[PDB]
Amino acid sequence: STTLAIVRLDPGLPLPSRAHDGDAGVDLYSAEDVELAPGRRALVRTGVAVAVPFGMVGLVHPRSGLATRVGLSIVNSPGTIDAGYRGEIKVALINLDPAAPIVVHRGDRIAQLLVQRVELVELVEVSSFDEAGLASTSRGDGGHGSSGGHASL
Amino acid sequence: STTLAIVRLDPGLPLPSRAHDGDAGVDLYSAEDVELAPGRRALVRTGVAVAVPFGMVGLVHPRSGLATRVGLSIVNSPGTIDAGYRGEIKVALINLDPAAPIVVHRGDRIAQLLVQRVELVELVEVSSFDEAGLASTSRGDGGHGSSGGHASL
Amino acid sequence: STTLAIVRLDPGLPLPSRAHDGDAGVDLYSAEDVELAPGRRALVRTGVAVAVPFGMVGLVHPRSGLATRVGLSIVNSPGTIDAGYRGEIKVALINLDPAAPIVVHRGDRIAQLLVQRVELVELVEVSSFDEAGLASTSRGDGGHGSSGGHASL
Ligand SMILES: O=c1ccn([C@H]2C[C@H](O)[C@@H](COP(=O)(O)NP(=O)(O)OP(=O)(O)O)O2)c(=O)[nH]1
Ligand SMILES: O=c1ccn([C@H]2C[C@H](O)[C@@H](COP(=O)(O)NP(=O)(O)OP(=O)(O)O)O2)c(=O)[nH]1
Ligand SMILES: O=c1ccn([C@H]2C[C@H](O)[C@@H](COP(=O)(O)NP(=O)(O)OP(=O)(O)O)O2)c(=O)[nH]1
Numbered sequence A, B, C: 001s002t003t004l005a006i007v008r009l010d011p012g013l014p015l016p017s018r019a020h021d022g023d024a025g026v027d028l029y030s031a032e033d034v035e036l037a038p039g040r041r042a043l044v045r046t047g048v049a050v051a052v053p054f055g056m057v058g059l060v061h062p063r064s065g066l067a068t069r070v071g072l073s074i075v076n077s078p079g080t081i082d083a084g085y086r087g088e089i090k091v092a093l094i095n096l097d098p099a100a101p102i103v104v105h106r107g108d109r110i111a112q113l114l115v116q117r118v119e120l121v122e123l124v125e126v127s128s129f130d131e132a133g134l135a136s137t138s139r140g141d142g143g144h145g146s147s148g149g150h151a152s153l
């Protein structure tokens, strides 16, 4: 398996775990009680540090239930935990509900951490994609809604 | 190819497809008409269920055109569809424009689904990264803007 | 290494680089000065175009420091740069702070670009997961907070 070394900076919280076999992420706990008014964010400690392997990345994603039920999100989602980072994972929670505050208690599961390979790319500067001998593509320079699919596009 | 079994829970919608060869995602349709006032979210049915292979994850990402043109986003982006999930994919749309409502019609393309491998990690609890014999890293405990690049950091 | 061809559409900006060895992303610069009032977004040029290899995807993620310090986010995060795209990478910045405007200067590092493999899936339509001979799963149709972990779930 791909092992991930982890330090429970706050040993009072359980180790992050998958809710079900095959789940992509292990759920991260809040070390803290925090209450977010509408529109407010906080930087919340999870009580863990990890050593993402070289060649990989840790990614902090919101949980869907809280997202829908109370509008909880993460400002920098997907949080990007670098392989060299040995500090505490912190989660930038934000309340995107307009009216109802969100109360987080220490020990709630407030996000999930995935680990994936990542390509540590070597940039090759060219003067044009033609010089790199790249074939023309279907997409070309099309983006930002170029394929349609909604009246505003 | 990597096959993805899919059930069209709503057979009136086309199968999700890539807009162009090589595109990362297949676009998901809204099964529903929904109108989001500024700041409001909804949990929108896509009319599909999928079986992400074990060892992989499905990821629901916003489309860029709607993001810019009308401020449409996804509260839990990137939505994390687990390999064991066999329910309907639902998209937590949110209107991040301050003033203009977003109207979604059934059959609009409102998000995109990627599939990637994911490392199903085995946590190894250590008392310190030293005990794991890990070398010191350049980054160390630096994060949350430690490398600079903006006046607020 | 995985090479990524890049055109500096704006040669006055440095090539994107990793802040530290092993970091997942290369930081993207703003080509532009832009000032975002609370709640406003902009579509910001980065001054680069890239050729993500076929079979891969580029992903534009927010930086964590700006996310926490000033509430900067990205409407379509994680931005999905397709392998066929040869246009300029643009970043849909948004100010999620309620009260303080964010000022971006040309040359600030405003996001980071990761490159990952992606599964270009072949959809296989089935009438039920049973027909595909898929085993029942632990998770079943559970989602959107089914595993608990917060009082609102
Ligand atoms: O952050 C981003 C995301 C996308 N893009 C460009 C590159 C990408 O290949 C292209 C299309 O992205 P999406 O598919 O995510 N958006 P949308 O579906 O609205 O556009 P299109 O209809 O062209 O696919 O837009 C950016 O420049 N920055
Ligand atoms: O959700 C997150 C994201 C990042 N981090 C930590 C780990 C990561 O390696 C580190 C830097 O993340 P980013 O590169 O995404 N943010 P930024 O570029 O602002 O910080 P730095 O200048 O240190 O790279 O911050 C977290 O604790 N939680
Ligand atoms: O965008 C999404 C994200 C998740 N889902 C479904 C599929 C996924 O496997 C399931 C659980 O997703 P999360 O783990 O991200 N959310 P949460 O942890 O709140 O739910 P659960 O407690 O069931 O794991 O919800 C969607 O339909 N759309």
Ligand SMILES: [Mg+2]
Pocket: A019, A063, A112, C147
């Ligand atoms: Mg979950």
Ligand SMILES: [Mg+2]
Pocket: A147, B019, B063, B112
């Ligand atoms: Mg698209």
Ligand SMILES: [Mg+2]
Pocket: B147, C019, C063, C112
């Ligand atoms: Mg960084």
